[PDB]
Amino acid sequence: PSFVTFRGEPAEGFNHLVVDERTGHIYLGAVNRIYKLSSDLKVLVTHQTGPDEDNPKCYPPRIVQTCNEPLASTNNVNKMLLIDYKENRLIACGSLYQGICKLLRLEDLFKLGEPFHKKEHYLSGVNESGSVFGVIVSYSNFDDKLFIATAVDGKPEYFPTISSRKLTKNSEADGMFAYVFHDEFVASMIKIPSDTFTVIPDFDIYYVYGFSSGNFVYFLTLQPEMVSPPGSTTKEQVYTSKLVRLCKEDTAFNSYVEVPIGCERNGVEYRLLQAAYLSKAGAVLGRTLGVRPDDDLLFTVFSKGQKRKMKSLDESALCIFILKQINDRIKDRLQSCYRGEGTLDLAWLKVKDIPCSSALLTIDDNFCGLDMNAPLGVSEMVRGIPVFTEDRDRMTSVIAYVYKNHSLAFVGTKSGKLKKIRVDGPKGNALQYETVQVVDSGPVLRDMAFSKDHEQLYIMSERQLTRVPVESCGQYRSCGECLGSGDPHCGWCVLHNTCTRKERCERSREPRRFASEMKQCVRLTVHPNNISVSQYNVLLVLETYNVPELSAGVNCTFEDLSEMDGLVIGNQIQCYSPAAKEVPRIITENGDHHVVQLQLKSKETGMTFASTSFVFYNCSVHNSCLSCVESPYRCHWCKYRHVCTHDPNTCSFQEGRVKLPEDCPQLLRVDKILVPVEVIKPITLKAKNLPQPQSGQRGYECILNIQGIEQRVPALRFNSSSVQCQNTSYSYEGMEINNLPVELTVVWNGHFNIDNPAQNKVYLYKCGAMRESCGLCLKADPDFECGWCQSPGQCTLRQHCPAHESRWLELSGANSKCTNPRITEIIPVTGPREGGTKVTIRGENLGLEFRDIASHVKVAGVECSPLVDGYIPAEQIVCEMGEAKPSQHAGFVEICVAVCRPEFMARSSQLYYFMTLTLADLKPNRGPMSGGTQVTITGTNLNAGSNVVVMFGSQPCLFHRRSPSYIICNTTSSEEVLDMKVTVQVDRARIRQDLVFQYV
Amino acid sequence: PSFVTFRGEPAEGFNHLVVDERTGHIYLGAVNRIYKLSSDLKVLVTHQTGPDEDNPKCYPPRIVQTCNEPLASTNNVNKMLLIDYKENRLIACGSLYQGICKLLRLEDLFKLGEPFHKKEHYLSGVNESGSVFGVIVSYSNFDDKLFIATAVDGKPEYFPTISSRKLTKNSEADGMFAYVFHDEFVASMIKIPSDTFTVIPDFDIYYVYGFSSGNFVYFLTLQPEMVSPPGSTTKEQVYTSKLVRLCKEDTAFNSYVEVPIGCERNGVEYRLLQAAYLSKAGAVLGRTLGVRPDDDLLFTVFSKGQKRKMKSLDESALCIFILKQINDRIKDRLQSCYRGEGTLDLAWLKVKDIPCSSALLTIDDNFCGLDMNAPLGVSEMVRGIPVFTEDRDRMTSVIAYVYKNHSLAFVGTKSGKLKKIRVDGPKGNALQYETVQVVDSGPVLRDMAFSKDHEQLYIMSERQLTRVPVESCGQYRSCGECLGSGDPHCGWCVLHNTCTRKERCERSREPRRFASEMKQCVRLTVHPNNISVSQYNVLLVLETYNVPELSAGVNCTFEDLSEMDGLVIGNQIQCYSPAAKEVPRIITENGDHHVVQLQLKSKETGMTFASTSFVFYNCSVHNSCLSCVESPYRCHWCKYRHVCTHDPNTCSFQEGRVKLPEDCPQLLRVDKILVPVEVIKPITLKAKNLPQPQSGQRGYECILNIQGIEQRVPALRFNSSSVQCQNTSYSYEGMEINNLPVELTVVWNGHFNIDNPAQNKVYLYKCGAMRESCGLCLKADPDFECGWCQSPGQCTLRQHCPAHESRWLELSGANSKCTNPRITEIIPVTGPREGGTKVTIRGENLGLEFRDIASHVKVAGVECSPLVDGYIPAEQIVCEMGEAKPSQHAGFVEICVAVCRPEFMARSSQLYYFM
């Protein structure tokens, strides 16, 4: 939705706004223009007040007398605007005339009159807008007048800052703007003294806001540095914001009072008034405030500090004053002066301090002021009660009103936004909402008025007027959300199922028709929360609370899908579930269950207000016993029918029903099922609650899901808990993998698959696909019964290998030597003569125990000692060679399993070579002291032996890789010093040489 | 249009005229000529009757016997003319033959015969025309005759004045003009007795008019003084006009009767017949006259008094006689004689009075006369009913006729004009029209006859015959004029838009087609009389009365500008106004309003007959409030818009409307606005209904229109009735004139000038351009406040002169003595020594009061006394010098203002000289 607005009809400018209480027409003061608009902000009429040839310096403007100074077309700013209902007109006081005032007719804006001739007719030279304010007060004839305050600009002789002036019936009449009582000695006006001007050059009083209360007139003002801040001579100007008051009845002007005003937040001072608004509290605020219904309140806005009235600070605070409290402060002050204590203390007015005179008097609120102890100031600054503070974006303006007793406050911001604040000190809370009806880039003005009907709030900007509704609750879809937002205007119109204000809800006055608090929402419950898909037209009872009288009629709508009529009895609603024809259309593809939001559609509104979680659950869809029972819902499984249903009767017969998950027909696990390929073997199974096949039903089968071949073997069900597939052999083609797990499915009557929770599988394993060597087979589990068969040179079960001889060989309990050891290949081919090398020998048919191999290994003559941890049985032996000093140079490797028997020994195909490695040169000769240099050691036979260590300066080098020609290592820090020697030690041999490494 | 006429074909002369009933041919008797003319007055044929060698004195003219007296070629005057239809000829009796008569053939004017031989063939020596008359009466054969009367000229033996004569079929026949019955004792003729001639030498009977009526023959005659007026011996002759009558049937001539006739108007006597005409009354006159249809009437014309038959008086009166009334007078007279009372009383005929004899008789109208109490006269003169009298221009002739029962009378005048008179004694009214068809300078003759068709009336003059239409209504342009003339023939042929007779108007019989009375002329009204310029095609209803059936079709034409079709319903016509496009073309430049004559154009004729005042009213043109409201029309002024408009709504707003003139905006006058040059002064003004300037409107200014410099000074409007220009000074360059009035215009909002009805002005005045002397300034009005300032030697306001001393001098109320008197010049330079001279001395700086100057003046030693009235203060002194007898001869003039102080005296530049 967009907000209705009026763009600066003169796109050029804007200054003041006011609303006519009866009509709702909105009048807008502006520079060079005054507009009359409809409530909708349509342009009713435009008046041209503007550009006049003039000059501020000239006194009586050009029309009255000739001015030496040159004139220029200048803009006439609407300083003030006030509606005079009685007169049926508008006082629209401008400037640039020496401040001549104009009278515009209410309906047409016809200029009734604009008195220029006399001195009184001129208000002030001041060009600034809003620095002026005032009130129009009227009574029947022979009782009446206008109170207005304006800045002087140092014009003290020409104009009075505050005055009490006359407003005659005839706009033509000369008398206008004349002082109510003029005497040579005293006139109903207050001028600024010349002495005060000389002392402080710039002193001026700017009047922000003004209002009539009871029988007085108050003004919120800004003044200069006078004893504040202290200063010997002129320099900087800071302002003090004060409150002023007058009796309406005092022609003498004796009643004048002036108290400084502000408020502080946690040690932060807020001295400067931006705007104010007098209003009522309403029952809520008033009660906790402790006020009478009639008592008034004053919302205000202040900026931080005393500095720069022209351009104030962002920091701003909304404070509050109860009029009773201010009245007390004034009465308190007066009762004091009457005591005779102290001075009057009003710096700008009276330079020389006059003392207060004591006197006997009954000091009342009615007190209008007396001749002695005449106009007076105030010592104690009146503090206000803080409400909301904005640091980031300065508040510009404020308004407030009573709504259903709750007090709503409106606050303009520098940004062009409005805040809707419920004041709850007297209640309990804070800011409800913020809105940007206005103008996204830049600010709002003090003239912000609510409409007469109080539906909207016209918000004025420099550029445009915007009709911001005090309420747009419609945005809220649900009772939970509506009441959730908290912006006080919104309530849940239960029957309408919409969110709006009290006025908007038809028949909201009636009970439970309208909901204010979340508790009131609507709460709904359905007795049969869960209904099965199979059921149809089931009776449901609805319990609803906090709902208005439904006698209009109600319908139950499960969703957009269906709607059934309902009848009301007691405090309940009775509706029926949908038909089976209707229910499954929903259920399809949702499967297990579908929660649906059952709503209530009211007959009068026709909108769904209340909802509940309604479950459609259908047992039949479940394909298996586990899903049926084990699932989350109440469903029964029929073992025989093999169908899941809600009704017990539907099952085949009594013994057939499955209520509990344990009872489901399922296969229990046993020790792993091992199955050799090509062997005829039975496979016994255990299980529970296996059904006895009924008439027209076949027996059990075992189905193995092997990708290569799927086997169907019939089986026998011995009892409710045991099964067995008949003697058969299984195979898979490929010989790719030794152990292949296979899923097995037990079926009966052809299709019926018994549940397998564990998902037990059959392991098909093949006699040595994996083991070519006798040592490997005997190594494997004794369970397999797989063993080595000598004649074939292969390994299989006894069943599998023919017995020419009485025996096929099986490790009886490891007491089985395994023959013809062979050596495939060994690592480090070469080694150092000194020894210490770790030889890694890899063979096929070695000894099973370490103890036998130890002492077995020999390299030629040289004794080699094997390592236990390193040794992997019958596959590999890691052995460390001893001292090689012998004459051989190169020799074959021999392993004798236990004993060096002729059958029992193995010799290496290629011989182990012994060598004296030498090093010629280093790739980098030099490197930094810190080290970390990649050294390239070149030489011959560098690969020999087991261990290698490189030492530069006896400090170790970090080894990387080794080769026959090359050794690569990273240098250590030569903490020692520049230069150094290189020692390489392989095993017991330590070789050195002339090649040196130089540290740089 | 011009009237058809026949000029004296003989340009030389003219005498008688007659019209042939069947043909319409007009025969005209003249001297030496007889003409036959067409109805149109074209010349058909001319006959030469004229100049014959002859002599009046000779009896049987030269042809019969030789005459001793010398002959001379003389003119033959046509004495008489009579149409003999039966005979198919014209009897045209001449003179100069001893009055031989001629017979001219009807068609060709071929002379059938002219009997000269016998005595009867000679009628009378008398040369005068028109003194003769008579009638031709005819019947089938063996019944017939001619009755003719003529003057004798003292020829009593030769010719009979009245006779009954024979008219034979053959013009050649000898018998012609023989007496019907001739006996030795009595013949059908009446002669004048010789005795009567001796007594009165000149006696003669002149016969003016004659006509046959019923079965008688009447003659209107003029006779001499016989017992009237009484006179012992001959001297002067006056005439008595009488009526004569005879039975057609009386061969004996016993029936002769003779009554004097005349009429009187308010004690004025009209005795002499100029002409007469027998006619019918028609239904109108007859009814109120109380007559039968057949009964006749006799219109006549008489001059005042008994004097000069040869040249009668201008005063003349048209009288009337009903034949029944005259017949009664005659019967009454006869029944009386038969009573045996009195004498016959006929002076000229019977010198010795014979008595009437009584006898038993049934006296009827039929009575033809008897042997005893034979021809007789009459005592009681028969009076006639007067009709019209002309004092200035004498009536000469008359005719009358019946038209649609109204009786129209025609009367010739000495001037050559014809009057068309409806006689309405029996009806009610007088003379309708006068015409000069004839001859503008000089008169018309008795022979005036209407045509057979009665379309025209041939009017004869000495010089020319003129065909005057009875009717020539075409001359009249408008219904108002047509019916205005009153000559009864004319009516307004509405659709034709012309003026003519009933016969001439086609379809006049139909209703409202023809208008007889002015009332009938056309009256038109339009319901929406006033329509605004802004409006277009407005429905208008037309009310017309006295109009013929329009079903032919009608169009509405506002003027020559536009024309809109109309439809007829009821007794109204509905037309539409013109479009806005059309209406303003007219309105432009007429301004306030334009009255237009909306006419109706008839479809059949195509001429606009009826009109009305139609108003187009444009308010907008009015520039000011006064013109808008104060003017003559309904217009409203909008104070705020400052525009004038017809619609109230158009004004800015309700409070802004100006309906009344008082409410406007105008400047009221105050005592004259005096403005000194070079002085800062405010000028307060008074006024009424000054507007309060509305939004977007500026304030008031005072603009002075001074040719040298125009000043714009802003002002303040205190209230609806007062203004004031701000402190300023004004000047004009030139120093030419002291008092300069200047027009001032008060304006607001720049251009808007407030109305200034009085046209009040500001008087800019500047202190003595005119007065070099202290005496002159103090003399001037106290109002100016201008006064003499001693130190400067000049004169200006106090404001203008610095006060070293407490005073500048102003005549407080004339109590202010004034220095240095001078004498420019004095009049009478010279004077007599004796004195008494009035010396007029003109100077510059004299005394303010007379009392001081008196005794001041001296001419040298001689004391001179000044005159109060003559003395104009400080400018001039009029003084009278005393006795100069002193030795000086010449001396200088001296004036001492109050006292002859050394500073205070003035002496003349040039001296006064005594001689």
Curated annotation (Swiss-Prot), chain A:
Glycosylation site residues: N618, N970
Membrane topology, Extracellular segments: 1-1000
Localization per record: Cell membrane
GO cellular component entries: cerebellar climbing fiber to Purkinje cell synapse; plasma membrane
Domain PSI: 472-522, 618-665, 766-819
Highest taxon of the lineage: Eukaryota
Molecular functions (GO terms): semaphorin receptor activity
Domain IPT/TIG: residue ranges: 821-915, 917-1000
Disulphide bridges, residue numbers: C58-C67, C93-C101, C247-C368, C263-C319, C337-C356, C473-C490, C479-C521, C482-C499, C493-C505, C556-C575
Phenotype on disruption: No visible phenotype. Mice exhibit defasciculation of the facial branchiomotor nerve and of the ophthalmic branch of the trigeminus, with variable severity. In mice lacking both Plxna3 and Plxna4, migrating neurons do not show the normal response to Sema3A and Sema3F and do not migrate away from these semaphorins (in vitro).
Tissue: Expressed in the developing nervous system. Widely expressed in both the central and peripheral nervous systems. Expressed in the peripheral ganglia, somatosensory, olfactory, visual, auditory and equilibrium systems.
Membrane topology: Single-pass type I membrane protein
Domain annotation Sema: ranges: 1-470
Annotated keywords: Acetylation, Cell membrane, Disulfide bond, Glycoprotein, Membrane, Receptor, Repeat, Signal, Transmembrane, Transmembrane helix
Record GO biological process: anterior commissure morphogenesis; axon guidance; branchiomotor neuron axon guidance; chemorepulsion of branchiomotor axon; cranial nerve morphogenesis; embryonic heart tube development; facial nerve morphogenesis; facial nerve structural organization
Similarity comment: Belongs to the plexin family.
Subunit structure of this chain's protein: Interacts with NRP1 and NRP2.
Function of the molecule: Coreceptor for SEMA3A. Necessary for signaling by class 3 semaphorins and subsequent remodeling of the cytoskeleton. Plays a role in axon guidance in the developing nervous system. Class 3 semaphorins bind to a complex composed of a neuropilin and a plexin. The plexin modulates the affinity of the complex for specific semaphorins, and its cytoplasmic domain is required for the activation of down-stream signaling events in the cytoplasm.
Name of the molecule in the record: Plexin-A4
Source organism of the structure: Mus musculus
Lineage: Eukaryota, Metazoa, Chordata, Craniata, Vertebrata
Gene: Plxna4
Residues represented out of the complete protein: 37 to 1036 of 1893
